[PDB]
Symmetry: C3
Subunit: 294 residues, 3 copies
């Protein structure tokens, strides 16, 4: 048995097809069993259209052994392209073994696994090619976003989006997202997000009220500041060049989006700004993006 053949075989039972249909449309993606009670993690774009049009879409989970079971949406987070599903009273679930993405190294070998019964499901091979790489992501009326991601040269496509990125111990180290290099959501973010979606059906992310574009001082140049926003109360002005958010230096607007999200809500945070040749350090207190659930 080949070295990758064995690892691929060992997780097949933990990876499911997810299928949303209506009267005139179908979607299909991959997901992974992360909990014996029947919790399935997939990425938010796979179920996006079912979540926005629930009166017209039905969602099913098809298991490795061909069993087909109805599924219900627990929660979703368009900002990390994650989502959680739930099947009830299904026995003999093989649960995927979650790794620790803070121990992964540039150069480790990985498999990007799609669901064995997906229409065009793929399993691909490569290495980890970069870590903590911000990447933007665009399929419905959901917001665009950016994720600190794992980069790999294994192909990530429609056939394995939502499935797991797998180390050589057959451990999940990320969730593939196709929203020729590929990217996955690191499993440690996946755990935080999924933990919060299972409890509350929602996660709350920090917000500041800024829109930025990338810059020759280099960084994220402020394009617009919302009135009443934390940014306003903190003194940020248009044409300012953000170079640091909290204790994260900021290379461009993509890294800006990610840096705001790892701030604590309602705590003071330093913002470092280059303003008409002068260096300025402001202080902002991030707002929650959704005040009722907070």
């Amino acid at each position: 048995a080949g070295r990758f053949t064995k690892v691929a075989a060992a997780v097949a039972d933990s990876v499911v097809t997810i299928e949303s249909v209506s009267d005139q449309e179908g979607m299909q993606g991959s997901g992974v069993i992360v909990d014996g009670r029947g919790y399935i993690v997939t990425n938010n774009h796979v179920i996006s259209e079912a979540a926005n049009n629930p009166s017209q879409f039905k969602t099913t989970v098809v298991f490795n052994d061909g069993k087909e079971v109805p599924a219900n949406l627990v929660g979703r987070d368009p900002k990390t392209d994650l989502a959680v599903l739930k099947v009830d009273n299904v026995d003999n679930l093989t649960v995927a073994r979650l790794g620790d993405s803070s121990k992964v190294r540039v150069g480790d070998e990985v498999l990007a696994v799609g669901a064995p019964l997906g229409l065009r499901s793929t399993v691909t091979q490569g290495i980890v090619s970069a870590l903590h790489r911000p990447v933007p992501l665009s399929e419905g009326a959901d917001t665009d976003t950016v994720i600190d991601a794992i980069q790999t040269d294994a192909s990530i496509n429609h056939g394995n989006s939502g499935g797991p990125l797998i180390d050589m111990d057959a451990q999940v180290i990320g969730i593939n997202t196709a929203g020729g290099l590929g990217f996955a959501i690191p499993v440690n973010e996946m755990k935080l997000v999924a933990n919060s979606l299972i409890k509350d059906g929602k996660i709350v992310h920090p917000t500041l009220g800024i829109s930025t574009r990338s810059v020759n001082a280099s960084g994220a140049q402020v394009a617009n500041v919302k009135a009443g926003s934390p940014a306003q109360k903190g003194g940020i002005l248009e044409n300012d060049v953000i170079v640091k958010v909290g204790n994260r230096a900021v290379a461009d607007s993509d890294e800006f989006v990610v840096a705001v999200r790892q701030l604590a809500i309602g705590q003071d945070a330093p913002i470092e700004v280059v303003r008409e040749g002068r260096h300025v350090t402001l202080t902002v207190k991030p707002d929650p993006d959704s005040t009722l659930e907070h």
Copy 2:
């Protein structure tokens, strides 16, 4: 010597360049020696233009050691993108070792080998990423087709189309076809087809008289039914949704094309159809696509 270096080296002598030229055009592809009498398997699109314009095209086989020998066309099958060539009275042919594609597993490592002396011939590495994956294929006045294929994440391109897909035992498990994932014709189909082309210069495939498009019941929706066709005599009507052909469930029109071909000619076969909300099981007897050679 590297692990792949050794396998690549061990088959180089079995892989030949195939070269079709005229007064104003050239084509070039790869082929593989499958028989000591001098039989070479390549894919049909590599020689397509020589086969349709034989008064103007000449075909040559260039061997690993630089020898250049004239070649003759034994037979070709546009429906599986396969073709067989023949060189005469060439001694010391190293024949490729044919594997068994029914023993290949998702995850096995493979090499996709082009001819060592091809202009831009490539040798690439990956794994088997899916099995029995229908794929459509489009370079002359030949019919389009669909093949139950091996999928791999090794790159398949002009530089190794027609060469062999190779396991770690240096055994041929498929024929690469470029007609970023790649596909190959599984060696077990290759054997059946080539066996029939060497004997008869032709192969006969079943036909039904249907054209289909993919479907929300899901499957292959009937777009047109030929008059006098087996489909007519069997009761198939336009707007019917084929969901099963023989004992093969049918996911879309691509899998429909492949499912018809593994039917026996002139034997009764069940077709399962969804017709105005009702499920219907018809009975058709496939015709040969070419009645004289049958």
Copy 3:
């Protein structure tokens, strides 16, 4: 520690980010330390714009440990897409170990390494897929060119262009160039070129005065002959089909460009030509492309 993880880690300190900025623009690429005095090899397209606009561009070398040091241009060769930089009085440089690209085999495993601190720097894995493969290359007012290159199925992109292509002994066997297969400049050419750029700030290549396009006799068809050129004095005429230059057969115009460059300047060289159905062998003496530095 994974097998590739170890090799990647072992060269990280030899690979630097190269950064050219102005008032309104930035470029960024990878380079590699090839000499303890502080010599860095990168490819010419990474620094092209700084070299043509030196009054407005500044060039910096950022090391693995975050240190940022000014850099100066030693010499560059657009014809091989190579360039040499120099940092002064930097201690504890880990110098990259140069391999021998004449010992590399089709099938060897390789890593294509970008600088660890590059914005979007990548590290990718594959095999050597072909050797001595001419490839054309196009980012400023620099000439286009063609290089006898190493081909690999490791991805080569903006994130590792200029970095090293690495064998499993952690030895540099080529310089990646992004000017889905990738190509690198073989390390043995890199050594010759860099040796000459460090001494003279220039390299002199042979020239003949011909422009060609590819051909049904196959080869490089002569499109134009400069007046006074070596080609003129040697008898080459338009519509001639060059099939051999020196002792290198010539498949197309791309291989023509490369074959001229390995000729000796000012020595007689045979050119083989097909002219109105007849085979003709001419004699040309290549001129230097730059007569003062010669």
